[PDB]
């Protein structure tokens, strides 16, 4: 990838590959030339060391480095550890149709709903809005619907209040210790900027309102919305899975 | 000068870079000759090679 200064990034894998290819081509030429054995021997030693550093650098007591005197990132170092593929890209991964905001109380809510700012509810629910606008024919393409949502005429708010009718969103607090850490709530649109959270599910989330933040994901398909409504709504999580005691205790 | 206290002559070249010459070897020094005791130039010590 270019570094935007005319040069390119280091990208340690290509560095290791260039090292291996250079040593290998040199050794092939030197074997073609029938060079004496003292030279081809340390050529093969260098090639073995280079392929060694490519496959897994640092498994030798010696590790070769580039900048800043840290060893390069080999193909085995791109799988191991907290930053490998398994723990950072496969078991848990970044997600579209998601948001994050501060939480306030909103004690007028019922147990099965959560506040949701109008801005977040418009940004998360854009494709559904495009579909409903093209159903009304108010913009008979996706480009005109895009500008139409961007301007925010008075009609897209009605499109929200229809596409948010029976559509749960999954609220999630950051250390999701237990399965009551992620729960689905029907949204209630708020002219504000903070996700209001029913003050009974705070004990389940372990959420004071002293500056916490919660993420909001959207279930898309019918299977996901029914999973949210049947399994993950807050009106199903009353007993704690750890022990039969209630978890919607008045706090 | 690293263990000896001596008396020196004080000579100011260009850029105020001073040259001290010993009084034991003041014969290396001559008076001016161009008739320009007010219009005399000033060289730079050590040249301008650098």
């Amino acid at each position: 990838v270019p570094l935007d200064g005319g040069r390119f990034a280091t990208s340690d894998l290509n560095d290791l590959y260039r090292r291996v290819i250079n040593r290998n081509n040199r050794l092939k030429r030197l074997l073609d030339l029938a060079a004496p054995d003292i030279i081809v021997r340390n050529e093969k030693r260098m090639l073995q060391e280079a392929v060694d550093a490519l496959l897994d650098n640092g498994r030798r007591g010696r590790a070769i480095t580039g900048s800043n005197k840290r060893p390069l990132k080999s193909l085995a170092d791109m799988i191991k550890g907290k930053q490998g593929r398994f723990r950072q890209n496969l078991l848990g991964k970044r997600v579209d149709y998601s948001g994050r905001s501060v939480i306030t109380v909103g004690p007028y809510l019922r147990l099965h709903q959560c506040g949701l700012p109008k801005k977040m509810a418009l940004e998360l629910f854009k494709p559904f809005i495009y579909g409903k606008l093209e159903l009304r024919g108010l913009a008979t393409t996706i480009k005109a619907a895009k500008k139409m949502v961007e301007r925010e005429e008075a009609v897209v708010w009605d499109i929200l209040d229809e596409v948010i009718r029976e559509h749960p969103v999954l609220l999630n607090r950051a250390p999701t210790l237990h399965r009551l850490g992620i729960q689905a709530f029907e949204p209630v649109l708020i002219e504000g900027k903070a996700i209001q959270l029913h003050p009974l599910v705070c004990a389940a989330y372990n959420a004071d309102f002293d500056g916490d933040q919660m993420a909001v994901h959207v279930p898309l398909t019918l299977e996901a919305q029914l999973e949210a409504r049947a399994l993950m709504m807050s009106t199903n999580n009353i007993l704690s899975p750890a022990n039969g005691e209630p978890i919607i205790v008045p706090s | 000068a690293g263990g000896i206290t001596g008396e020196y002559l004080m000579l100011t070249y260009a850029n105020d870079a001073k040259l001290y010459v010993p009084v034991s070897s003041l014969h290396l020094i001559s008076r001016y000759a161009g008739g320009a005791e007010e219009n005399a130039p000033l060289h730079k010590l050590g040249g301008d090679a650098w």
Partner: protein
């Protein structure tokens, strides 16, 4: 070290160094390397060690030893093949021929086509040929307008 020896007499070679409080680390590395390889046939190993650290310079420039972002050999053979085919087909003389009969106007003031201006070395070379071979000011002006356009 190779100046001594040269005959059946065993020949010693001393590398006196200053006292080690004022030698850089690279110096002791060099000295221990050159004292390690005290054998016969060590020259080529030492040369291919000097390469690989120093790195070969430009394949199509000056500056023999250094990394310094050369042009690739795989690119270079293609560039040279394009030059060979254009040259032979065209049959223009070498640039040096255009240097030979050149009435020397060495005025030691820069005169070339800059790299970023015409990046393709082959095409820039073709302009060199066609400019120095232009034998009419009208031809020079045609070169000027074509180069302005291109």
């Amino acid at each position: 070290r190779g100046r001594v020896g040269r005959s059946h007499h065993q020949a010693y070679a001393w590398l006196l160094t200053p006292h080690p409080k004022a030698m850089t680390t690279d110096a002791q590395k060099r000295l221990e390397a050159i004292a390690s390889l005290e054998d016969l046939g060590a020259g080529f190993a030492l040369a291919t060690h000097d390469l690989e650290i120093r790195g070969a310079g430009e394949l199509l420039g000056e500056e023999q030893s250094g990394s310094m972002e050369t042009i690739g050999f795989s690119l270079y053979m293609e560039l040279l093949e394009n030059a060979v085919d254009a040259l032979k087909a065209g049959r223009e003389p070498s640039l040096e021929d255009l240097t030979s009969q050149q009435t020397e106007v060495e005025l030691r003031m820069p005169s070339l086509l800059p790299d970023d201006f015409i990046p393709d070395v082959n095409t820039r070379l073709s302009f060199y040929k066609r400019i120095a071979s232009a034998k009419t000011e009208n031809e020079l002006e045609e070169i000027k307008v074509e180069l302005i356009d291109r």
